[PDB]
Structure formats: C-alpha cells, structure tokens
C-alpha cells in the first residue's frame, strides 16, 4: 500500500496524512438464472397415457411443436420395456430444441420389437412401418398385455402381412386392395392366392411375454435448418442468498446480493423499482417469494501513514464496507508478503467510516493527528505503531464560578502571531 501511495503521489516521499489510492470492488462469485415454473410441458401423456393405440399398419402420427418438452419423464420413468435413441444422447434431450416432432404410436408383438430399428427387415419393418437407416430420434416400447389382450383372442389390432413393395421410411399404407399373390388376378376378390391383406394378432392373456402385445411409441425429430419450435425445460439454477452473484430472472439481468425480503407485491407485480427507478426487489418466477437487491461493495481504499521521513509502516482504510469484505479485494493476486499482511489479522478494527487494518484501537483520547472520520483519528506513537483513537475535543477545564468572586489579572504578556493570506495568481493565458 505504501508503494501504491507513492505511485499515486508521483513521489518517493510521502508526508503525514491520509490519501485515497484505489477502489475496493467485490466481484461476483457465481451466476444465477431463474425462469418460470415447470409450466406447460408438451402433451406427452396424451400419447403415452392414451387408452387405445392405433394399429401397426395404421400407426398414429402425432405432431408436437411450439411447446417445452420435458423428456426427463421419459427416461427418469422406468415404465418402458425398451428405451433407445439414435443420433442424440437421451440425457441431452432435455437440453435440445427441434423444429418439429412426430410421435408414431402403435402396438406390435413383443418379439417383433427388434424389427423397430434402422435397417430392420421383416413384415413389420417392410410393410407396416419402415425406419430410415440414419434415424434421428428415440424408440420407446412397453408391455400392454393387460390392455391390448382379451380372453378368447383380441382381434382389434391389425398388421399388414403382404404388399407389393417395402414401405419407405416414415411411410404408411392404409389401402387394403386384395394383393395379387399369384399369377391369377384377384380383381378385389379374396381367395386362393389372394389373402386378407391385414392380419389380426388375436392377443390373449395366456400369450407369452414375447407373444403378448406391446405398445410402442417412436419420437422422430425433424431438423431442416428451420427455427426450433420445441425446447427442453430451461433448467433454472438453484437459489443463492447473502452473497454477491450475477442473477438473471426471466431476462431481468443484474448483479448484487439477494436477501430475504419483507415487501408485499401484488399478485400481478413482479419486481419493484426504487425512487431513482433502479430495480430494488424481485420475485422468483419458479416460486412466489420476494428478494431484495443490494450493491456489493462500491467501496474505496485509502492509506493512512505517517510521513515517510518518520516511519515506514502504513494502515489501510476500506471505506463504508464491512470488515469481512476487506480481504475480498481480489486477494490471492497481490504481493504475498506485503499486501496480504494487511488483508486481515488481529489488527482489524471497525468504524462508521469503514474497516481499518493496521491500527490498534486504544482507549486514551488525543488531539486529532490524521482525521479518519466519524470522530475517529489515527496517529503514530507508543514499539512504535499506528493507533486509532477517539478524537479529544479539547482539554478539560472548569471555571470556579461564584456569585461574588472575581478573577483580575496581575501581569500581562505581549504575543505576536502570524497570519498568511493569498493575494493573487499567476497570470496565465
């Protein structure tokens, strides 16, 4: 600090006094981003909790767009026999945005679930639902025996067993014209060499797990350089209090210290502004509580030192700041043996002016030598060290007043005193 004062004064000799040198600024320690509550997630339940699903050949396509997608309910939930994704990390889904989403829901036999994958073959893949080789999305399946099976054979679900050509990726074929399986044309007449184009699984509760019906939902994400309509929930940071931090409440960005607030906002009110129009209080979007905003330090740093001709030690004053902030002055970066000694020790003292380090708080009172402020003064005397004391207004004296006594002088003294007054200035043009 003494060298800093020397540099500030542009001199190697510093006289007795107090000099303003630098500013103690507290930098933020963390970052906080808070956004509205979980809110309106995309309608996953509609597809998943749907009472009845369509057929594999008539697989139902559901377009999802313009909504926040909370994929955590998919993998965080172990209510799915099969869970896999292609081209993306399943855990990363909650932090991804997509232009469009297509949920293909249907029912197929459990043993046939293997056919639901890129480059798969078989009747289900070829003629009921074909996937692209480079499919980008996720495939989900779960058991549906208790839902898609009935005693005596459940014949509601149908699948396409015959067709002229394999279905293209994301292609559905609902036309059920009699397929010409033989040289003799069927002419739309079922019979020999002309079989019912669809087929019914006939799910029964006695069916084995492999043969039991299984409900499958496939989420395919479309990215065509277009604006993203779906976006995973904006993960909001936790709540930090009583510490300097950069906060961003649903776009309202600021830096300060969040503290519990005793205000009372109206239900429609979000944040308050001071008389100067500066933001003063804010309410968390996720949950309804109010917090107050305060500046961090905004403090200044001054150096108290007797004349270098007299001594060499110094004392540091951090203006209008707590004594816990003092050592938070970008410390761990100054000189190891010279600045950190003034960082904190038993010498620390607190006054209305600010935190004072390097001066002992004695009880005795003396005439002010270096004015600290708020009635406190500092001086160098004692073994010699710096002492901060309370200013002595003057010597104590009482006049022996009485209603018939008097004091008359008997001798005098002639005193000569000097008074200096400026009269002019250099005539500069």
């Amino acid at each position: 600090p003494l060298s800093e004062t020397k540099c500030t004064l542009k001199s190697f000799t510093v006289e007795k006094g107090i000099y303003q040198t630098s500013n103690f600024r507290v930098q933020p320690t963390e970052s906080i981003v808070r956004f509205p509550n979980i809110t309106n997630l995309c309608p996953f339940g509609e597809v998943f909790n749907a009472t009845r699903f369509a057929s594999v050949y008539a697989w139902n396509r559901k377009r999802i767009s313009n909504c926040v997608a909370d994929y955590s309910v998919l993998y965080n939930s172990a209510s799915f026999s099969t869970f896999k994704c292609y081209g993306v990390s399943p855990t990363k889904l909650n932090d991804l945005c997509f232009t469009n989403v297509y949920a293909d829901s249907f029912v197929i036999r459990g043993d046939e679930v293997r056919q639901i994958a890129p480059g798969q073959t078989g009747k289900i893949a070829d003629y009921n639902y074909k996937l692209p080789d480079d499919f980008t999305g996720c495939v989900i399946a779960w058991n549906s025996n208790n839902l898609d099976s009935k005693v005596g054979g459940n014949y509601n679900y149908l699948y396409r067993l015959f067709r002229k050509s394999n279905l293209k990726p994301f292609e559905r074929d609902i036309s059920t014209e009699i397929y010409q399986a033989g040289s003799t044309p069927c002419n739309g007449v079922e019979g020999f060499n002309c079989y019912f184009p669809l087929q019914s699984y006939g799910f029964q509760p006695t069916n084995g797990v492999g043969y039991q019906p299984y409900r499958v939902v496939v989420l395919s994400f479309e990215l065509l350089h277009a604006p993203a309509t779906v976006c995973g929930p904006k993960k909001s940071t936790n709540l930090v209090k009583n510490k300097c931090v950069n906060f961003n409440f649903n776009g309202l960005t600021g830096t300060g210290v969040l503290t519990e607030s005793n205000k009372k906002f109206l239900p429609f009110q979000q944040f308050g502004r001071d008389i100067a129009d500066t933001t003063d209080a804010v309410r968390d979007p996720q949950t309804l509580e109010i917090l107050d905003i305060t500046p961090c330090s905004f403090g200044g740093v001054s150096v108290i030192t007797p004349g270098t001709n007299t001594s060499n030690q110094v004392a540091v004053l951090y203006q209008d700041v707590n004594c816990t902030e003092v050592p938070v002055a970008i410390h761990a970066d100054q000189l190891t043996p010279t600045w950190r000694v003034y960082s904190t020790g038993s010498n620390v003292f607190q006054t209305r002016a600010g935190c004072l380090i390097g001066a002992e708080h004695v009880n005795n009172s003396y005439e002010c030598d270096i004015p600290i402020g708020a009635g406190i003064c500092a001086s160098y005397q004692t073994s010699q060290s710096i002492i901060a004391y309370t200013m002595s207004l003057g010597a104590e004296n009482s006049v022996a007043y009485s209603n018939n006594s008097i004091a008359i002088p008997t001798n005098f003294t002639i005193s000569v005193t000097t008074e200096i007054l400026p009269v002019s200035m250099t005539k500069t043009s």
């Epitope: 081209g87 993306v88 990363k92 932090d95 991804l96 480079d134 980008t136 994301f170 065509l224 350089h225």
Partner: nanobody, 122 residues
C-alpha cells in the same frame, strides 16, 4: 485442422424463367450433418432460409421458394444440391449454405460457407 467447411457454387445471373442448380460441398471434421440447409442473404435483405434437408431425408422449402426450388442430398450425403426451376426476380440474392453438426452428442454447431450470388433481371 480440418474444421467443418462449406462451399457454395452454381449461382449467377439468369434470365427470368430460366433454371440453375446450386451445389453445396461440405468438408472438414464433419461428424454428423443432422440438418442441411440453403439460405439467401440478398443485398439489403436479411438472410432467409429457402430449402433444407434433414439427415432423415425430410425436407423443408420456404414459401418464397416452394414449388420452384427442389433440394436433393447426394448419395455421399456430404453435398446438397438446390435445383432452381423457373427462376423469378425474388431469387436475386447471395445464397449461403448451412449445416448443423452434433459434436459430442450435445454441441449444436452451425457451419456456413462462402456463398454464391444469383441474379434475375427483366
């Protein structure tokens, strides 16, 4: 060193009612071209998407170019060609090419090329 790079070509001045075909070549450390797109930033106009193709073959075409520009992805799946049919005055623009790459399965990086100019006059 082989950072993802895009190159655009095929544009130029064309008489109204003509046709051309822009070719976009991708190079560098291309991990996965999840989405592939064509844009145009005409002189004095903001960049606007015209046609794009996802890695799954699905394609989007802007209404300003729908029905005239057809986007096709090459067999190598590294280059995309935008066949411009019946080029109209609105096609006068500096065409740019973009692709989205999922690096590490979590980083969406958009890469752009130099672009090529197209012009239609009366």
């Amino acid at each position: 060193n082989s950072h993802v790079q895009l190159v655009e070509s095929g544009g130029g001045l064309v008489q109204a009612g003509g046709s051309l075909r822009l070719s976009c070549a991708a190079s560098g450390t291309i991990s996965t071209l999840n989405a592939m797109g064509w844009y145009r930033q005409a002189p004095g106009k903001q960049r606007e998407l015209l046609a794009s193709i996802s890695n799954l073959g699905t394609t989007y075409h802007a209404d300003s170019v729908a029905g005239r520009f057809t986007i096709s992805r090459g067999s190598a799946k590294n280059t995309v060609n935008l066949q411009m049919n019946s080029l109209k005055p609105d096609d006068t623009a500096v065409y740019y090419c973009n692709t989205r790459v999922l690096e590490g399965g979590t980083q969406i990086r958009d890469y752009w090329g130099q672009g090529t100019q197209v012009t239609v006059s009366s």
